Design a protein around this ligand. Structure first.
Ligand SMILES: Cc1cc2nc3c(=O)[nH]c(=O)nc-3n(C[C@H](O)[C@H](O)[C@H](O)COP(=O)(O)OP(=O)(O)OC[C@H]3O[C@@H](n4cnc5c(N)ncnc54)[C@H](O)[C@@H]3O)c2cc1C
Ligand SMILES: Cc1cc2nc3c(=O)[nH]c(=O)nc-3n(C[C@H](O)[C@H](O)[C@H](O)COP(=O)(O)OP(=O)(O)OC[C@H]3O[C@@H](n4cnc5c(N)ncnc54)[C@H](O)[C@@H]3O)c2cc1C
Ligand SMILES: N[C@@H](Cc1ccccc1)C(=O)O
Ligand SMILES: N[C@@H](Cc1ccccc1)C(=O)O
Lengths: 684, 684
């Protein structure tokens, strides 16, 4: 059944537990305030006003409301992005960003009467993203309507790889133009081999607990599993999967699966003519371009099988939209709701400042220091009781890695190489303080953060009349125009998304949404970085013409006598001249789009995911928590940012209670105690 | 033992055979002209004037000299780069490029009296790069002097990873500041595990033919290996290594090796605080930052083990300089020698034009078509007998991939999406024509090329007085200043290279040479793309200050209780203000620096490497060959470009002789017959 409201989606994934946190359903943990704080007047900083920082603010507001008369929380939120919604009370971006939730409003002079929205970052939300939908309910209510995201396969789709063309909806051969397609056949082989069957015989190549992944997904998503089953997944079976397969790439796993299927005769020689290795390779690459429901994962073939398996267990591709004009509205509404729930006990101030350094210093009550620069490069220093560092890993690195790894009598911190003013701190310890006695422990967390993999990504947009889809040369599936195109043209994945400002006259032509090497191949043509146009009134016309030129390819369709230039070239050219656009996340200060783990990376990302458990070590007294999708096992999803925020606040509560986990609610306790601790000594 | 001349290097590597072409020493094959051509007047195009194209030209000259009176070869060389040396017959680059062999001349107004050279691309040449040194002899003579390239470890070096600092020269612990260093221990573990022993017991973890790679390297390099050894490596043992390990990344292999050593007790818990998996991870990441002799291979951890193994067998890190002021002189000299060796039978014309399309068309004997655009964007169409496509894979894609995969009655080819004029070709076949009957076969080569991995890379340079190294603040080790710095600061690898224009007053401060994610992390700070400054008179001061600022880190050393800002900060800041520079290969039209194969990519790269064997099918009228390091098993080396050129010309000979391999010399025949063919034709 298709979910139709926020509440329907919310309930669908409410119990789902991810395999690295299999003892807890984050939505259940988040149902009530996470815990209790001692009486006091707290001074907290949140660095970053994206999904992570704003979810953390919301949870702090819920905590604040439980404080007794005379107590409260003050939060300073640092947000360097001048386009953040936090600083706002033709293509417009000002006020339309919340980090990587980022809209561009296409208008003709009056932004209150726009044509369309480009969703530059986050855009499609898994049904089983339970924490995402929990917060969407807080922001919009359960009754608010949602739509199926128009992914390849969800709407009529054209797929092109090499000489192969397909036109399809879903996976039922009755809905494919060629029901005998090799593409659909290889999908079945690769899906059988990776996911397997929820009932009956185990057919998957890479079992978890000796069974198909499908069977484990059903346990992870149960209300009342075995408890014993979740513990065994958490402590035994998922760790054993990691031990076996964290060194195996997705691309290698696809090839293994295809090889066995080819040997068995489930897949035929390609064309009847290619030799064994050529046939296997063709199928591997065909599947690579086709994907799992959101376009080709070829560019993602270097991720570990472990990372892919997380997405498989989550049924990640089954996605919806939010009940918004622009996705940034979600984060803005959560910010406003934070302030409302705090019931007067939370006070929030926004600083348009870039944090340059964090440390612990001095001997005062508040020892968590932040050094920042304002928009005219003036320096500021402030000390806090606790700090949540809600920025992704490459943005976190300069803040946490330049103070060394142990006690220092004095340091002059700041951006001295930029010629900016430094600040002297005394009796200095690193911010990410895992040990009082081991510089290597402090170095492990810093070095791990700095070597996480930020996947590269870019989006090319234009504005097109929706009626362009009705041109005679746009193909149809049962009378509905093709609205998604997945191709090896260099464009990778393309979408003709109806404007949300409304049938709408205009659509957002997401001409190219690329990852990893697909993005690298395009980057030389972008012209201006990270955004072309850099101005509200420019147009990235030259850039966009290079994308139309990539689509200028002769494509042969079955039964046709000759190839003609691809119809998609014609569609791209139908976009208006004004408002052509590219955003390159790679050349944004994030240094890419979102974390995806390579082989071996589990050790690094999982350390970050578990970092908040430092709060168990009472005498350590570390005041810094981290909150981003970079510090999760769902990089590239709001779910990851939100999970990491929940971890950070849970840890903060434990720390504020000097290591006492009974200060967490019963439901929230496993956020801390269901993970391996990052401090072995001291115990707690 | 250290080679001191071109000739000594040339003779050292003359016999070396790479494992994917184990039957043949390319230098031995290149000792005489590669074969014979029928009498005639050939019209050949070479697309690209880099190492691949120019070596191909040289080999065509050698062939041309053998043709009878009235015969000859006319070559049109297409070169789109306005800075190519081919079009030239403060920071100056004009005339100082040969593709990715690329110099920047720093001068103060008179380019004939410069200060230093930045080697922006190629810079360090393995001793056993036999074909490289063969051509270097052609260009410079055997007597010309060479120097050891000042790699980390070849000169006094500082290494920084997390809390770990090492100062060292070589691999003898006597010359490490800390002979008990964990870095030295992990290096020894990873060498034992990957390379093993040339004599006695086999200790490596990934054997070839059941023995350590060191033993296979000695066979591959032998003047006269045992009977059948090379054939068994080529057909059995190297294919078996690929089948086992091409799905294993380098990073995964390092972790496997470290894990076993940790379990055995060879590597201890890092300190008393880190758990087992944290210690293992620390060692894997420590080794990752240290490397194999040319700086950390952490950014290269996603390469297949097979790709690393190629470099191990080749002793890749043992490298030298060329006998030049600028490396481009090598390619320029080879171009001039090509014309000389042609003995008036080779005529060469240079076209300052960008090729947009290749195809076969029409009914004339010259059926190989190239469509190009000149500097006024005017279209040109020219037909040839044969074409050598000497450009790397992302530059080749638009040329070969937009004509479909079978016959077409007509096509209007060119850059129509750019608004440029097209040309109508009739009776069209794709250029990379593997089959007259299988679109999938034709698709395999195209799709393979387009999905090869171009490693990302960037270089940040500045000019510093060499005497800066003599300041008390620059550490000395074993009698000389530190001149190589390998670090996790974001800079990755840094070198203070004496100017070749001369002890020289100035040095090229290669402040940062990055690969892969290390480059991605920096890219947002480059300011202008692909080069800052974009003009001869500017300086990339703002960009460079962001690099200096990455060096502004408190570094604890054993020799002082109070950590100070890293000395390297001071050194970077000692560079002069003028002539600060970055070049980003990623945003160059190459879409990166050079091919490195991911897991699974052997299937694609090896297809490209073997492509020239199409010439064996006489009934197939394919006139196009490919010549670049992208189509080799040595992406990122001149050796790969040169091997691919040799393949291309060998294939061209066989095609010009209508499939007759006896037209190759005895020693060159294996360039074609020693590989698995890409077409199936009768034995013998
Ligand atoms: C191309 C792309 C596609 C995506 N698609 C989806 C999708 O379809 N579905 C989905 O669920 N998610 C998607 N995501 C992921 C989603 O956008 C992220 O998971 C989430 O927005 C990240 O939130 P965060 O708080 O971790 O970090 P960010 O969003 O990066 O926010 C960090 C904030 O900190 C600020 N900041 C950084 N450094 C400093 C500093 N030094 N001082 C002060 N302020 C600072 C930034 O300006 C920013 O506002 C996508 C993202 C991208 C880029
Ligand atoms: C950062 C870096 C570091 C390196 N380090 C080393 C090293 O230390 N040692 C080593 O041996 N090698 C090194 N290399 C590798 C070496 O530079 C390459 O292997 C070699 O130069 C590649 O030659 P090529 O002919 O394959 O391609 P290229 O050098 O890319 O030459 C292709 C030529 O074709 C032209 N061209 C492209 N497209 C078109 C078109 N459509 N029409 C017309 N002209 C066109 C280009 O302008 C260019 O001149 C390095 C390279 C880089 C970038
Ligand atoms: N959620 C994003 C980013 C992402 C891509 C692939 C894997 C994981 C995350 C998308 O669906 O495009
Ligand atoms: N030859 C180049 C590029 C390269 C790097 C790493 C591996 C292979 C090639 C260098 O030594 O920097």
């Amino acid at each position: 059944k298709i979910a139709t409201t926020v509440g329907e989606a919310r309930l669908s994934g409410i119990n789902y537990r991810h395999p690295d946190s299999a003892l807890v359903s984050y939505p259940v943990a988040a149902a009530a305030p996470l815990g209790r704080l001692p009486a006091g007047n707290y001074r907290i900083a949140i660095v970053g006003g994206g999904a992570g920082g704003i979810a953390a603010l919301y949870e702090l507001g819920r905590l604040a409301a439980t404080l007794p008369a005379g107590s409260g929380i003050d939060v300073q939120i640092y947000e360097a992005d001048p386009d953040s919604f936090l600083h706002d009370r033709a293509i417009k971006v000002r006020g339309l960003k919340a980090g990587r939730v980022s809209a561009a409003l296409v208008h003709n002079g009056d932004p209150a009467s726009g044509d369309t929205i480009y969703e530059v970052g986050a855009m499609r939300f898994p049904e089983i993203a339970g924490l995402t939908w929990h917060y969407a309910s807080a922001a919009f209510g359960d009754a608010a309507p949602i739509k199926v995201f128009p992914n390849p396969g969800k709407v009529p789709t054209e797929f092109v790889f090499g000489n192969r063309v397909d036109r399809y909806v879903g996976s039922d051969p009755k809905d494919w133009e060629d029901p005998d397609s090799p593409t659909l056949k290889v999908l079945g082989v690769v899906a059988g081999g990776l996911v397997g069957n929820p009932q009956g015989e185990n057919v998957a190549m890479y079992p978890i607990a000796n069974v198909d992944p499908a069977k484990i997904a059903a346990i992870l998503n149960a209300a009342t599993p075995p408890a014993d089953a979740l513990e065994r997944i958490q402590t035994k079976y998922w760790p054993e999967f990691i031990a076996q397969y964290d060194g195996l790439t997705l691309g290698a796993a696809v090839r293994e699966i295809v090889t066995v299927a080819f040997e068995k005769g489930t897949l035929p020689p390609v064309d009847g003519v290619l030799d064994v290795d050529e046939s296997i390779s063709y199928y591997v690459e065909l599947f690579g371009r086709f994907g799992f429901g959101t376009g080709g994962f070829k560019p993602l073939y270097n991720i570990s099988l472990v990372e892919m398996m997380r997405l498989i267990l989550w049924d990640y591709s089954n996605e919806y939209t939010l009940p918004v004009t622009e996705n940034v509205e979600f984060i803005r509404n959560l910010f406003l709701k934070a302030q409302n729930v705090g019931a007067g006990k939370l006070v929030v101030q926004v600083r348009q400042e870039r944090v340059a350094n964090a440390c612990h210093s001095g001997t005062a009550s508040a020892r968590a220091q932040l050094l920042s620069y304002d928009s005219h490069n003036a320096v500021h220093s402030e000390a806090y009781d606790f700090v949540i560092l809600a920025v992704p890993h490459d943005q976190l690195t300069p803040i946490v890695s330049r103070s060394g790894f142990e006690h220092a009598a004095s340091q002059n911190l700041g951006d001295a190489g930029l010629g900016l003013e430094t600040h002297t701190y005394n009796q200095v310890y690193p911010p990410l303080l895992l040990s009082d006695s081991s510089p290597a422990a402090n170095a492990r967390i810093v070095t791990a953060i700095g070597q996480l993999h930020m996947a590269r990504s870019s989006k090319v947009f234009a504005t097109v009349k929706t009626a362009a889809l009705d041109q005679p040369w746009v193909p149809q599936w049962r009378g509905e125009p093709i609205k998604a195109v997945v191709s090896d043209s260099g464009l990778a994945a393309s979408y003709v998304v109806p404007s949300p400002i409304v049938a709408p006259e205009y659509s957002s032509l997401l001409a190219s949404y690329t990852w990893e090497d697909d993005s690298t191949r395009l980057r030389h043509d972008f012209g201006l970085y990270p955004q072309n146009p850099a101005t509200e009134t420019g147009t990235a016309d030259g850039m966009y013409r290079t994308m139309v030129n990539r689509a200028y390819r002769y494509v042969k369709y079955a039964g046709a006598s000759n190839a003609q230039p691809w119809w998609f070239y014609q569609l791209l050219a139908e976009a208006r001249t004004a408002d052509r656009f590219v955003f390159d996340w790679t050349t944004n200060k994030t240094a890419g789009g979102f974390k995806l783990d390579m082989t071996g990376d589990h050790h690094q990302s999982n350390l970050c995911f578990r970092y908040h458990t430092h709060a168990l070590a009472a005498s350590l007294d570390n005041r810094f928590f981290i909150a981003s999708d970079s510090y999760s096992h769902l990089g590239g999803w709001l779910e990851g940012a939100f999970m990491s925020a929940l971890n950070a606040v849970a840890g903060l509560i434990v720390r504020a209670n000097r290591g006492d986990v009974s200060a967490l609610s019963t439901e929230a306790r496993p956020l801390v105690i269901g993970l391996r601790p990052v401090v072995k000594v001291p115990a707690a």
